[PDB]
Design an enzyme around this catalytic site. Sequence first.
Site, PDB file in Angstrom:
ATOM      1  N   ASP A   1       0.812  -1.209   0.000  1.00  0.00           N
ATOM      2  CA  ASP A   1       0.000   0.000   0.000  1.00  0.00           C
ATOM      3  C   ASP A   1       0.848   1.263   0.000  1.00  0.00           C
ATOM      4  O   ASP A   1       0.310   2.359   0.178  1.00  0.00           O
ATOM      5  CB  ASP A   1      -0.951   0.007   1.196  1.00  0.00           C
TER       6      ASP A   1
ATOM      7  N   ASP B   1     -11.726  38.533 -32.206  1.00  0.00           N
ATOM      8  CA  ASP B   1     -11.200  37.184 -32.369  1.00  0.00           C
ATOM      9  C   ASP B   1     -11.998  36.155 -31.585  1.00  0.00           C
ATOM     10  O   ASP B   1     -11.942  34.969 -31.917  1.00  0.00           O
ATOM     11  CB  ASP B   1      -9.738  37.130 -31.936  1.00  0.00           C
TER      12      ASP B   1
ATOM     13  N   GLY C   1      -7.801  23.221 -32.718  1.00  0.00           N
ATOM     14  CA  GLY C   1      -8.671  22.546 -33.666  1.00  0.00           C
ATOM     15  C   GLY C   1      -9.019  23.421 -34.854  1.00  0.00           C
ATOM     16  O   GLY C   1      -9.076  22.947 -35.990  1.00  0.00           O
ATOM     17  N   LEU C   2      -9.247  24.712 -34.606  1.00  0.00           N
ATOM     18  CA  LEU C   2      -9.546  25.638 -35.694  1.00  0.00           C
ATOM     19  C   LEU C   2      -8.368  25.755 -36.654  1.00  0.00           C
ATOM     20  O   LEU C   2      -8.551  25.764 -37.876  1.00  0.00           O
ATOM     21  CB  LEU C   2      -9.923  27.005 -35.123  1.00  0.00           C
TER      22      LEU C   2
HETATM   23  C1  PMR Z   1      -4.460  42.399 -43.292  1.00  0.00           C
HETATM   24  C2  PMR Z   1      -3.757  41.429 -42.716  1.00  0.00           C
HETATM   25  C3  PMR Z   1      -4.348  40.533 -41.702  1.00  0.00           C
HETATM   26  C4  PMR Z   1      -3.617  39.711 -40.837  1.00  0.00           C
HETATM   27  C5  PMR Z   1      -2.549  40.181 -39.884  1.00  0.00           C
HETATM   28  C6  PMR Z   1      -4.242  38.475 -40.794  1.00  0.00           C
HETATM   29  C7  PMR Z   1      -4.240  37.457 -39.852  1.00  0.00           C
HETATM   30  C8  PMR Z   1      -5.372  37.156 -39.102  1.00  0.00           C
HETATM   31  N1  PMR Z   1      -6.550  37.319 -39.744  1.00  0.00           N
HETATM   32 MG1  PMR Z   1      -6.726  37.292 -41.653  1.00  0.00          MG
HETATM   33  N2  PMR Z   1      -5.430  38.703 -41.485  1.00  0.00           N
HETATM   34  C9  PMR Z   1      -5.666  40.050 -41.618  1.00  0.00           C
HETATM   35  C10 PMR Z   1      -6.861  40.412 -42.206  1.00  0.00           C
HETATM   36  C11 PMR Z   1      -7.386  39.622 -43.236  1.00  0.00           C
HETATM   37  N3  PMR Z   1      -7.131  38.307 -43.215  1.00  0.00           N
HETATM   38  C12 PMR Z   1      -7.818  37.771 -44.249  1.00  0.00           C
HETATM   39  C13 PMR Z   1      -8.709  36.704 -44.099  1.00  0.00           C
HETATM   40  C14 PMR Z   1      -9.281  36.371 -42.890  1.00  0.00           C
HETATM   41  C15 PMR Z   1     -10.479  35.939 -42.356  1.00  0.00           C
HETATM   42  C16 PMR Z   1     -11.621  35.397 -43.175  1.00  0.00           C
HETATM   43  C17 PMR Z   1     -10.226  35.570 -41.034  1.00  0.00           C
HETATM   44  C18 PMR Z   1      -9.140  36.372 -40.674  1.00  0.00           C
HETATM   45  C19 PMR Z   1      -8.813  36.562 -39.370  1.00  0.00           C
HETATM   46  C20 PMR Z   1      -7.596  37.101 -38.904  1.00  0.00           C
HETATM   47  C21 PMR Z   1      -7.001  37.141 -37.559  1.00  0.00           C
HETATM   48  C22 PMR Z   1      -7.655  36.673 -36.289  1.00  0.00           C
HETATM   49  C23 PMR Z   1      -6.993  35.360 -35.883  1.00  0.00           C
HETATM   50  C24 PMR Z   1      -7.857  34.188 -36.263  1.00  0.00           C
HETATM   51  O1  PMR Z   1      -9.035  34.138 -35.848  1.00  0.00           O
HETATM   52  O2  PMR Z   1      -7.302  33.139 -36.657  1.00  0.00           O
HETATM   53  C25 PMR Z   1      -5.664  37.372 -37.705  1.00  0.00           C
HETATM   54  C26 PMR Z   1      -4.736  37.993 -36.693  1.00  0.00           C
HETATM   55  C27 PMR Z   1      -9.699  35.500 -38.708  1.00  0.00           C
HETATM   56  C28 PMR Z   1     -10.637  36.095 -37.687  1.00  0.00           C
HETATM   57  O3  PMR Z   1     -11.364  35.338 -37.008  1.00  0.00           O
HETATM   58  O4  PMR Z   1     -10.595  37.315 -37.413  1.00  0.00           O
HETATM   59  C29 PMR Z   1     -11.093  37.788 -36.084  1.00  0.00           C
HETATM   60  C30 PMR Z   1     -10.526  34.843 -39.805  1.00  0.00           C
HETATM   61  O5  PMR Z   1     -11.470  34.103 -39.633  1.00  0.00           O
HETATM   62  N4  PMR Z   1      -8.610  36.873 -41.785  1.00  0.00           N
HETATM   63  C31 PMR Z   1      -7.760  38.772 -45.306  1.00  0.00           C
HETATM   64  C32 PMR Z   1      -7.629  38.490 -46.783  1.00  0.00           C
HETATM   65  C33 PMR Z   1      -8.750  39.170 -47.573  1.00  0.00           C
HETATM   66  C34 PMR Z   1      -7.484  39.952 -44.655  1.00  0.00           C
HETATM   67  C35 PMR Z   1      -7.105  41.265 -45.286  1.00  0.00           C
END
Ligand code: PMR
EC number: 1.3.7.7
Lengths: 419, 420, 402, 402
Positions: free
Chosen positions: B36, B274, B409-410
């Site tokens: 134990d 975000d 996961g995302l």
């Molecule tokens: C302008 C540049 C930039 C950067 C630093 C990222 C990373 C990143 N972009 Mg993504 N992105 C920005 C904006 C945009 N991103 C693009 C696409 C995209 C989308 C659909 C999404 C996103 C997002 C983001 C985010 C948030 C991190 C994420 O949720 O993964 C970062 C820092 C993300 C989100 O949820 O935003 C809140 C997400 O679903 N961006 C586009 C191409 C047209 C632009 C201009």
Amino acid sequence: MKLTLWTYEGPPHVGAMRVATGMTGMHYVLHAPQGDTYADLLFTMIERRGKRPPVSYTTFQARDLGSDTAELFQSACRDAYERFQPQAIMVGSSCTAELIQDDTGGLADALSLPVPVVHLELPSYQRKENFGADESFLQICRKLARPMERTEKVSCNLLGPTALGFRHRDDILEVTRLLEGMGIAVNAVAPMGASPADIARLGAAHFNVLLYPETGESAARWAEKTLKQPYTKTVPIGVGATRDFVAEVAALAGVAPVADDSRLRQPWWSASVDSTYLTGKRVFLFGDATHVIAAARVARDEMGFEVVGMGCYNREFARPMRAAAKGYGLEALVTDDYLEVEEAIQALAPELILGTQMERHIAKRLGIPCAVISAPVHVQDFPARYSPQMGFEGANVLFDTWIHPLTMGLEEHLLTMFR
Amino acid sequence: MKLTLWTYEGPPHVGAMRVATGMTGMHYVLHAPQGDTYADLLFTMIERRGKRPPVSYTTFQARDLGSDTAELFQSACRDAYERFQPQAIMVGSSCTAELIQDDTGGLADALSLPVPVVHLELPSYQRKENFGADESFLQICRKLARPMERTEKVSCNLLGPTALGFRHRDDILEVTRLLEGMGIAVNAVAPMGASPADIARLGAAHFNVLLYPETGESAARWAEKTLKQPYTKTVPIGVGATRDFVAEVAALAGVAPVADDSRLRQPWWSASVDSTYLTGKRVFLFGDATHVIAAARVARDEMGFEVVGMGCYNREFARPMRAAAKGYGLEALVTDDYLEVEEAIQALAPELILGTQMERHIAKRLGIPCAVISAPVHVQDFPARYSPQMGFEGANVLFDTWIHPLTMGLEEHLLTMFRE
Amino acid sequence: RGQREVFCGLTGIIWLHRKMQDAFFLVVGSRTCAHLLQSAAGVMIFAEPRFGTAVLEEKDLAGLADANAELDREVDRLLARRPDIRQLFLVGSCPSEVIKLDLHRAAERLSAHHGPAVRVYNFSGSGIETTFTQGEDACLASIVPTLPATEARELLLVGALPDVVEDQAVSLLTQLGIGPVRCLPAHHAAEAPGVGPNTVFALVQPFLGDTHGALTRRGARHIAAPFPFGEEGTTLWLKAIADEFGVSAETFEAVTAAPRARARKAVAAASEGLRGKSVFFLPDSQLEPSLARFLTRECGMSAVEVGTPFLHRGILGPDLDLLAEGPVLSEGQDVERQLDRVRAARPDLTVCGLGLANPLEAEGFTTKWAIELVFTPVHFYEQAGDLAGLFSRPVRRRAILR
Amino acid sequence: RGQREVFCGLTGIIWLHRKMQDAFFLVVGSRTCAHLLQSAAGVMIFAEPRFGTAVLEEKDLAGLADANAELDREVDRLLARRPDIRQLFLVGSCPSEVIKLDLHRAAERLSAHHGPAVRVYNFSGSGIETTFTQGEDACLASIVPTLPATEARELLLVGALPDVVEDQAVSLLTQLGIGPVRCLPAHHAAEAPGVGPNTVFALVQPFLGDTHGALTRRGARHIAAPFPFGEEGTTLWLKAIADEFGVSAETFEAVTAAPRARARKAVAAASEGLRGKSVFFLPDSQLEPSLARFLTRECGMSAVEVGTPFLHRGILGPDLDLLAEGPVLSEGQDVERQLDRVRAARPDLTVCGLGLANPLEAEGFTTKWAIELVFTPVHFYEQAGDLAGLFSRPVRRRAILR
Ligand code: PMR
Ligand code: PMR
Ligand SMILES: [Cu+2]
Ligand SMILES: [Cu+2]
């Protein structure tokens, strides 16, 4: 003309922009084509900043060229002063604005704004973001900081922490805790917690503490010459480097070396029978030279790892990186291309990789443990929790973050074997 | 009677060893068969103590039965005293020694050791581990704590933290900084960071802070009854619960409520763009009642999730569980069987699972993001880093820890969509 | 007129190359545009994308013939890596335009270099000329003057659409029964369709104006309709298609009755959190007129202002007729004045640019960011409920948190 | 006598569970033994393993006949749940032994009314009677009563060899030239060996005493060989087996020369850190004299004492004979005095249990945990270097960490 898919650093105008948003009351007007506002949301997203970055783009279009571009610059600076009300102004140009015959300093000087104006010259195609941040901080120090009288108590300046930096906030807190335990008082922190008044107070500190050489070497050297302030050459990442930094700071200040290692757990948790398998594991290190050098020292000495790869994406730090790598019997992989890093990883096959976000994703495709230790990071890598990379608690954070992928791999492999 | 492969809590004597390991200078003498000693080691790895847990075993065998068991217990207790020189001793019985008619009371009394001996009566087969820890702490308090002149200033006791506990060590520091910020100095902490001197000093505190009800409830009730010690009923896990705890403790101490919100970053990060996808996430919550209730409050109120599952393995806390679960429109799952929890998870199919290590493994098999918030854990969950679950820094830790599996996961799904 | 918060047109590449698997977008730009693509793409960057930017050095900006030679050599190295790519897209960028490097002559040279298989179209997405979703139509507006002619009267879905939404639109148009559908953005160059005076084009996204001009020169004539955002807009879109092709009203109604009811219940479920609320539209995506209309009638919301980086009255006509007389239509952007205006209005929800989303949340205004509507399927009937949910979610989170 | 720190025999179930695929280990014990199995298994419990505990309640304690009835019901439910299980093992425990519940009579009844498909045996893992690895001895000795009586000479390898180690040993023996080889812990009931007067057995493990006794009553004879742990010990084991099989020395040496070279090189590859070091063995796993001989002769590591919970001279003779006279043997276990002994010796490596490893490490004593040898494949030639590295790694880590 080599095509670039991933860039470890951005243009220097981004780096100088990491200084403006860190500072409070410093707004900077930058000449950019309409559409260069993407870099603004780096702080609002990656760093999750409530404040709008102190950037007022001119946003010139194809319709307005020639004298119209100067008109837009003049009006942008005028509006920035008139409504944004910064305590100080600094002026820069983007790559496109640099390419045209645009002189940032002349228009700002012709405006004769009462607030001080700092003209930055940055070769956007030769240099990169880190040089932009460093040279911007240098210009701000040269314009504002003056050799003012020393403080009564021992005062230290924390140079180097800039916005959109890896663990800069928590590292600032940890080093402030160590300095307070020593007895030293932080006169000012720049550029993260800085203000144009604070930079004028840089001459007050007895010595400067250079946390990140990438953004603060040139300010440190300039303060060493003009302000007669000696700076620390060691970075307190890991237990050994933390003790060396404590000794160096105590020697500079003259204070007694009181370091609260009560918080310390990394040495004992490393010495336990659990961490026996950690012995001899192979590690590949990439990222900024300071982080990689410190991480290699930690992995070899405290973590019982065999430093198997070492490289930095700062070509400006080629010599310290090479010297450190020769210290561990390797050659420094000073490259700005992710493909050379990937070929090194494949041909080398480390057990664990510590590096940038590109580093981590390369490891994920290669199916080997990955952890992030360098400046290029994602939004998730910026933590809400208190995760310093420096100091004694930073040692615990480093140990947990480095051993977490190996523990996940071991547990998953054991489970798969058991099923 | 029933085939059990996984037990959420161990035998009642383990909690007593947890209390013994928490306090310094207290020795636990166990009448247990050889073999134990397995529970001696959970502390040395999972809790990673530098020194052996202050417990001793008689380790009787087939040869040592009948009166030989009594002789073995006598000799073991005497040797434990003469070797370890503890300031206090408690004696207990395992299941095997509970089967035999050996009485630890008479054997411990006959030695008449000068240091105070605490007599532990725990029904092993009927009861469980948390009751063992609670009753051990209660008996130590009765045998040691005495009515004492109150402290000159406002002083408080942290009651509940025992060894082999979910981030107890970091919660101690976080709540301690909260109390010093509010102007209250900690008198003593028990069982962790306690000595037989400190247990006697429990009467000097102005009020009691009950951090963990599972192991510290009975002590607080006894202190209220005899020591005249009001005990705080709010567990400061999460921003809202932390503010409620701050207000309650400030009222109890009479000092103005001053809390440091500068370190707080969870509310803003949850308010960021975000965190929008977090809204409407369905979360299953299982584990110890207090941690799960607090986590459900955290999730619903500022994480934006919807709590589609709630349950606990603490039968002693079934009523607060069922009361709290009603506030969210659900019936609780008060069970100690892993098959029932697994079937509940399968039926619910939550997007995120917050619970014990078993819940994490169940989610891993089912491909659901998982995080650990409750007591049954491995070495991995015990961190070297500062990872509190209480206070504002604990709220930041909770945010990051809970959204890490979801963001992982995302990211994996995004990479799979982008390139096959 | 002033500062304009909107991304330069190369950001349209990030969702274009997902539609076009045989197209590589070779950006000719400086370090800044490389950083834009890498940042915006974010997670895309780690999955071997189809966009790469050839950085211009100080030795590159000098001269044009040397720059053309280096661009050609870079294209050859890339084609060595990716022989699968057959429709490369040289993309003009701000420093590339200042160099005045001839993308047209480069297109001709590279097309002659790999005539039989790899044919290269060049467009411009520079910030000085192109902004955000104008990056997309500019890419399509470069393919159109070079697609082959056809002599069959056909319908074509002009505009990039997700595969799910594309197949749903094709299924709906086939359920109408009259008119074959040939989507203009060809996922593969071998699958390139034909456009001529016989064909008629129905717009599916509002930012496609340069494609409008290119198809006008092609000889096809536009059919104006509300754009497919919500049940009602897509209903009028299909109605205008049926009127153009003479499809009977009763057949169209029978085809659309059930999906229209599904879309209506979907928007009704999500609009509840938005009922009796206000919206502010900051000009980023050009999607704003149709979105404001859909939120105004289907979602029952009130619009303080609809802002557009560029307002094309010709195509947005019908959607403007559906749109109420309430909100003020703004063309162009002044980010400081617009920020002051949204602070004054205190809207319940603000569909704003992403760089301004977090600061507006800090000031206390719930925000929605249109770039997700750019990627997320928000078009047509089934995705209309998701489209309503996208706007509902921020307000719902604001209610839950506080 | 005094405080002992060796686990009760139920810990040997978890690895026997791994070796025996057709065997289920039903432990009739209290909650304490269930907690033992859960803590020891670690990750294994999460993989729905084959060991389960029938926790007795207070009513189970009060009523013997009631306990027997609910045991029968539990086994019926288990057989319904798991049709694959063909042999089931009732494991005695400390509370069950105090109950006096005759698990042997229960096994007889269960095999009577569940056979012939389900074969039901009993073995005792109680700490009051069986210590640690003797549980493996208890099970392997409980099976041999039911083994058939054969008339053909057979070689019987007895021990829970890892499957890879098992196949290496089988191949090595077959290429020696011996006859048929059988393994006592067969994975399936139909694969169980046969024992008779002509049948002969060799012990791979030292703590298999009870089996060594039990097989003798059925006519089998033992092989006098050192246990094949690494390099030369394996050679002596195979050579004694060959001698009893009449295999000539020269063909044996020709066969084993190839593995011997790699075994020596692997041992030397990891013995460099161990050179000039002292070892201290705590009685945990009855393995200690064998690895002590390996370390003293092959790795050249000084031994201050060798501790075994119960040293069986009959099987440990040759290994003890090869072990130097200088090391002293420890019988029994008193960890309180043994800790003072280890402090007096100040050994560079102290082999002990997992429980005492961390506190000894905190005191500056590099520690190795003996439970790992029974898990990791460490016997025979190829794993000699693995065992050497296993012993050297803590020393290396202490050297680096200073
Ligand atoms: C302008 C540049 C930039 C950067 C630093 C990222 C990373 C990143 N972009 Mg993504 N992105 C920005 C904006 C945009 N991103 C693009 C696409 C995209 C989308 C659909 C999404 C996103 C997002 C983001 C985010 C948030 C991190 C994420 O949720 O993964 C970062 C820092 C993300 C989100 O949820 O935003 C809140 C997400 O679903 N961006 C586009 C191409 C047209 C632009 C201009
Ligand atoms: C006495 C109880 C106990 C517990 C809690 C476990 C699990 C566990 N015992 Mg070791 N261990 C104890 C002893 C023994 N363990 C055993 C098994 C085992 C192995 C394979 C391993 C190990 C170890 C440990 C550990 C550390 C878990 C870790 O490595 O993350 C736990 C808590 C672990 C190690 O030491 O790390 C290198 C490791 O490799 N245990 C066995 C099964 C017969 C026993 C009884
Ligand atoms: Cu992870
Ligand atoms: Cu994980």
